[PDB]
Write an enzyme that holds these catalytic residues in place. Sequence first.
Site, mmCIF file in Angstrom:
data_model
loop_
_atom_site.group_PDB
_atom_site.id
_atom_site.type_symbol
_atom_site.label_atom_id
_atom_site.label_comp_id
_atom_site.label_asym_id
_atom_site.label_seq_id
_atom_site.Cartn_x
_atom_site.Cartn_y
_atom_site.Cartn_z
ATOM 1 C CB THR G 1 -0.946 0.047 1.221
ATOM 2 O OG1 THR G 1 -1.815 -1.098 1.205
ATOM 3 C CG2 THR G 1 -1.800 1.341 1.226
ATOM 4 C CD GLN G 2 1.962 1.892 -3.782
ATOM 5 O OE1 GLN G 2 0.768 1.611 -3.636
ATOM 6 N NE2 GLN G 2 2.559 1.934 -4.977
#
Lengths: 212, 235, 244, 195, 222, 231, 233, 240
Positions: G1-2
């Site tokens: 996740t970013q």
Amino acid sequence: TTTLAFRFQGGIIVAVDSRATAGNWVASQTVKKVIEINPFLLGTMAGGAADCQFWETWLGSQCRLHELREKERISVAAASKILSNLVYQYKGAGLSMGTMICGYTRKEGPTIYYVDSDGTRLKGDIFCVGSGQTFAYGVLDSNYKWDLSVEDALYLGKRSILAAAHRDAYSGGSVNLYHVTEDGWIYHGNHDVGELFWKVKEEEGSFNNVIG
Amino acid sequence: DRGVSTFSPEGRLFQVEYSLEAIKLGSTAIGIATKEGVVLGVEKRATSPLLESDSIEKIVEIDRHIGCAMSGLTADARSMIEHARTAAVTHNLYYDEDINVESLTQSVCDLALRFGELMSRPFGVALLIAGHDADDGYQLFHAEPSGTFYRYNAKAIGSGSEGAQAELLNEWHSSLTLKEAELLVLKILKQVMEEKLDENNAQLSCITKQDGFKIYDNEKTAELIKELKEKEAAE
Amino acid sequence: GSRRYDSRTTIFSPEGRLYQVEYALESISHAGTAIGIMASDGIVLAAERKVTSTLLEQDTSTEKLYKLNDKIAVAVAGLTADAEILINTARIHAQNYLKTYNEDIPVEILVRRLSDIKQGYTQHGGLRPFGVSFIYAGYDDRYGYQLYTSNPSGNYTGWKAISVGANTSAAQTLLQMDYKDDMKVDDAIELALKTLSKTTDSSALTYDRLEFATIRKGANDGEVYQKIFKPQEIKDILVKTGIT
Amino acid sequence: MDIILGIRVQDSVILASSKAVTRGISVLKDSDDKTRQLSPHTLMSFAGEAGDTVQFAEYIQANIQLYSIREDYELSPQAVSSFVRQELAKSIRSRRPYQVNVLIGGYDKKKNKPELYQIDYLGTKVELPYGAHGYSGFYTFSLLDHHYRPDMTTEEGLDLLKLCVQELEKRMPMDFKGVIVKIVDKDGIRQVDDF
Amino acid sequence: QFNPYGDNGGTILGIAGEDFAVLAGDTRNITDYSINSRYEPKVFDCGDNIVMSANGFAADGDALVKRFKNSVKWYHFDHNDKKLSINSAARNIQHLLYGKRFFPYYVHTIIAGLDEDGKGAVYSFDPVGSYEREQCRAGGAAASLIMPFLDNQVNFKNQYEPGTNGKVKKPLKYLSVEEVIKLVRDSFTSATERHIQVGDGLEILIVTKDGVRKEFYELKRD
Amino acid sequence: NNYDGDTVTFSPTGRLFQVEYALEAIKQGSVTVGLRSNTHAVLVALKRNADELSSYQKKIIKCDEHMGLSLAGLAPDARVLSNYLRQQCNYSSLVFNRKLAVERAGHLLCDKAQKNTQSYGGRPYGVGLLIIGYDKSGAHLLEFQPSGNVTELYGTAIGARSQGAKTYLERTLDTFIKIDGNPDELIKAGVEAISQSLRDESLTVDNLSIAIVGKDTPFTIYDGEAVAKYI
Amino acid sequence: TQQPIVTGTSVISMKYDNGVIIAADNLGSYGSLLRFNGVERLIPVGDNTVVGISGDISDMQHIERLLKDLVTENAYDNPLADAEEALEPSYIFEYLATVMYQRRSKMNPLWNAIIVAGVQSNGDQFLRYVNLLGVTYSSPTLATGFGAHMANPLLRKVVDRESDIPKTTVQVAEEAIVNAMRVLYYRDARSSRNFSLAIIDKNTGLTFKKNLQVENMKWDFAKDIKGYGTQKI
Amino acid sequence: GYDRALSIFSPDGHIFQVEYALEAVKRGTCAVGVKGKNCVVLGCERRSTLKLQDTRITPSKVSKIDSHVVLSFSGLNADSRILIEKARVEAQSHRLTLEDPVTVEYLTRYVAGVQQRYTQSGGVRPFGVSTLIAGFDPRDDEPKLYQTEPSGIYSSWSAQTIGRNSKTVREFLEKNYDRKEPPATVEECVKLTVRSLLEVVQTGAKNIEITVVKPDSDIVALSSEEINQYVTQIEQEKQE
Ligand SMILES: *C[C@@](C)(O)[C@](*)(O)[C@H](CC(C)C)NC(=O)[C@H](Cc1ccccc1)NC(=O)[C@H](CC(C)C)NC(=O)[C@H](CCc1ccccc1)NC(=O)CN1CCOCC1
Ligand SMILES: [Mg+2]
């Protein structure tokens, strides 16, 4: 769901409903909540449909492997404990299962084991499991004796599921009946609640709460 | 010394060829396939009279539709049988059906050449795998430690094998009944065995579509031995 | 590849013997003699040092007798460095048992564990065995005073009196002759020293050649005391028994 | 699982454990034995999270029975309690700890003394003349502080236990469906069938 | 935070006849209020006279179909070109779905074909692999609209024989392929009127002993 | 002699004896023929039986819809290598939506066989393979040897007495290459080629095994009464 | 996740009678800051394929390197690398779609929406979409981001269904694309005036046009707009 | 890890390491098993080269695996401990999962399977041990006696012997043991077991150990004086 199993003079009665739900959506009225593991062993299903179907089908395979290896029918105790030890490995991961493992062996006699997804394993004479368990218990406990006729015991099991099908929003469809003896399980039919309810109302004089 | 997976100058694996010699020292096992069923019979060969012969388990169930007889280092067969049983049950779990006899045999044979420097040596046991499925009907397979398997109308393995195979060459035809095949296994076993054949030192079994895989009682085999003696005396 | 240079330390001979175990026992037969004698009121451990030099610092030296805990000691015959590997493992096992059960380890359980470690080196791993034989002297509240021995095979047995290392055949005959069941510690001390005095390959038995120890339930108020003898104390007990 | 009690008298240890098994809305069973025999003179009662309780109890039972066969000897109650404590103290820093509280009642055959150990799920061990886990102790300890003497007989211990159960039946909200009572003494473990 | 799931809409429908079976699906693909495509096929011929659709999150649907198609290929290799029966296909799909029990395929799956007695078969799956054989099933966004209609028109539910007071039910019958396709088309025309995610086109795959046939019909594009 | 104990050892003349001994296992195996035109590619294989009661060992294995091989030598090694080819064909389809090139399939087999010839503990593969296929550049025939050497050819044969069939194909080269849009005549030429490697035994109904792949023809294997036409 | 940092906006595309057209502006935004004004977001692969990428630019540059490496790898041991075994649009797409879905399934996506435009060996038009979730679809017109909401309606007036594709010439199709880019410049706050356009035709091949500008803009009516209701001056 | 294949085939089809493990069993002290009508007796030799031993604490030759099953052996003593430990662990594991103690056949099959595994695993030699496993199944009064060996084969025996001079005692048992009528009582069975050991032992009562196992977990080891009474009675009858 509503499922029940009880011990009596003439063996074990097992009765279940046939409804599957997704929230308030009625997904199906024709589900099979009894698994026939072998001619002397039955499994009942309540909770997650996939969890129950997958792991009880898997249980059947593990029971078959036992009898190939040991040249002998698996005990009800041993079969139930395979399932309870498996779900215990998965504890906290979110499996949802409420089950009864019901059968006869010579060494044990007729035996019922309650097994659930938080790891509980209990031997007993009477169990009701599912969203509609309380409704089944209400009818079952009042008319239960050890020494019912096979005919009366089959009816009580059928009638207890009918009671739960009526009152519980998440139970219904039809009633599947089984009788377990020395000689094995015997199927005693599928009974649609849409016909059974009215039949029972007229013949028994019950359900006076309803407009009939 | 020398590698376990070494080729000889003739193009054969030393260890596989040496395991085949161990199988020649084993007790005799015979299989005969018919259109009414497949019969599997073995020589028990108790090393002493105090040994309780009923505990000699050289014929073995894999599934209801698949039986197995062995010859050679019989202790090596236990993990092969365990794999076959697991493969049979696992396939039923994944596909809601009986597993084909050929596919089961192939799975057992995939273990065979998993040895090196995995297990330290090949298996020292040959198997006769007999069964029935809907596609190819009644079948008999010979599974070796080379990883190869052949289908057979009839096959003998173990110490009396070449003598028994020549006899099976003459006797087998496509119209054989199950009763005829039972007697024929008993006949050929009696011929190649050192000790005199009876219900306690030899064992019969079969696999039919209706009743599945059954190991015969000693009382049932005794009657078939008595029936054999009378029919040979009849001419 | 590497197969060429493998001695194969964990195989049977045609006769059904373990080559490396047998050859390790041959090594141990040249090591200095160690004797254990068990009495009704205690145990004696006596052992002969191998390297007589006038310049060896004896009072700070330890090649034969080692402490495993307060209740259990060992006499070593064989490679000292090999023995120290096993000794430290045994010290740890004893403390693991004390931590778990809050009770001192029973003698047999400690002996079995060490003996199982030795066994493993004969069956798997392709390594040479430990070239060590131990005499275990210990006390617990189940069996009381106990003597055991273990060897490189991992086999162990219990004894009333026993010897390991050099001249064991001769030593065991002498012990079998003079040992009695009603014997006491002071008598067992005398027997141990007399047996070494006759079996020794040296010209005479002296204080600078010996390591000596006793385990007595003759401490103040019914406890068990491990005494590792100092050089001067070995010299005194040699004069007392009448050897020097 | 709800109520487990223990009391150590002159020559025995008495364990009382409730019979009810309740899941959410329903009482599924009213005859549940919340105990395992670890050895002939050592009994462990247990309570805590569903599944964990029996799994832990049977795991301990298997280990003590294994020790008994290996050494041909019965571990002292003190030794069994220390083994159990270490298993729980190990458990508390695991991925998923055992949520199980136990009482261990044993008769030490060497010392000729009854012994009662209370151990919680964290591995907190104490030896006590009387013990309880969960909400039980809020009622029962004050009683036992009043009525207990160390030189009491087994019959006096059972009467004192009836007085505990009566108080719990009066003042606790849950119906625990009575108790199974077991006595641990020099002769072993036996169940009091009428209570 | 990253959300690994999405909703591509669409609706599917399986009906089993006496010697045939149909699997129908709309051809519209959407995200939120946008149309991605007016013709993106959702029902697939998987070989061995089996048709499949995994409606819901299209990426998981495509992944599942792709894995099942591959499962059929490897079933041929490993078992001597044996035909994968519809019951066996169904059990295999349960294991594919339950394999991701703790990170599910976000789809409702329907397969259709013929059983080993040549009779029409429809099987239905939840996201984590529970399954059941049925005469009828609708799946996806407009399932709640379509299923009650099928209960009424395929299984004759709540219908009685006129003049029998209400004690003889309408007897169960197999429907002809012409009659089934009429019910399929009306189901999707109705769903398109009332569900925003349903429209554009209707693609029906019909399975008989002779093979797999296709029919396409226009649906409203608003 | 002293340099044949394992695959990791060169001999003084730069030879790998274990690889050469593996090569010998192929010569002991039963004969199989491969040939092709511009449109189609054909495998013909003489299957071997243990005795009259036994079945005839299968020689031809399907790898994909457009590719497959015939074997000669250790059959279990052909199973391992064909399974690897099945997976590589499958990877190409799933990841790239691309049918694996026959030339690239040969390169993959070469490299897989090689690793077993340079490292200790392992052994070389004891089997030779004839891979046929139809890809984006038309019909192809490959020969695989377990030394690692893979060769693209118009025709070839491997196994016992294979030199007879190989000579016939060397003469017939100009004729059979031109058999375009006629599968039965190309099979006839393959059956006539394998006949040159026979002695004593002749081609019976359960002895012969034929396979074909081409322009509008998937890889299909013919056994039993399906090959009676060509006898 | 970013989270995406430097970002590219819409990519738009359509099929016409003999091929495909694709376009995207030359901007790399840093939130509301219009940071980088010379970013190429159409990346050709061979002479038959153009991959148009929107979303995170760091992930775009990663994908660009994957495609560059894919061409290198395809050339290895391949005498027909510039002929029958050259990379196809369908091969390039399926590869990217596999990567996208694998990355989302590890909860570490490539934060992009991608359109692969090209022409196949047999002359067939190829146009297909894939995004960070692994979702794929094809249509006669395709667009990402704001382009989905604004460009597709305009492009669908030219090609509304499959049967309209043969009726649409390259001049008509390019005109529609250029107009759509103007509409996006009026209405998308993270767009720019400067853009790149690529035509892949089955006859005339790959034509790549750089440094195009939105022109023929209507702003004159702005002078007549005063206040927000009651103001008269 | 050490991966070397120690157990391998030789040209004549033999696995020498397995056969050499049998030679280690041949060297070991004699062990005998005799089953009666309602009992099983396990007799064991103790070599009298070792005196000055402590018989309280020395490892006894017969080992309890569970309360209802016993294991004796011939061969390497150290090796036997490893099999006994694994068997004891498996006995408790079976009780834990199946809620029933092991059958004698099941326990034998497990021990035999461990022995077999060590004949085709890399880096290990076979166990130099053969075992006699005896007892009664749960809730069963039929006596059970099994034998295992280094190869991993196992089988059931009416009576059997293993170890040094086992050929001689097997000869004795083959003529003296009747299948149609086995030793009816405990006395008769112990007497036949002691008699059979007296063929080889060549010393009084210190060299013989006897263990009687009866149904329902009733296992007891006889003392020196109890065994010495059997030795006295046998030789007094023999003088005739
Ligand atoms: C009827 C009863 C009282 O609930 C009884 O216990 C029965 C017994 C079964 C039939 C053996 N149980 C159910 O009907 C369960 C109830 C339940 C639902 C969800 C979680 C736990 C229990 N029903 C199902 O399992 C249900 C069966 C389908 C409808 C045939 N499946 C789902 O609800 C399904 C999977 C849920 C799930 C997902 C991930 C991990 C674990 C479980 N969910 C959906 O299909 C989601 N949604 C999609 C759009 O339509 C609405 C449903
Ligand atoms: Mg209701």
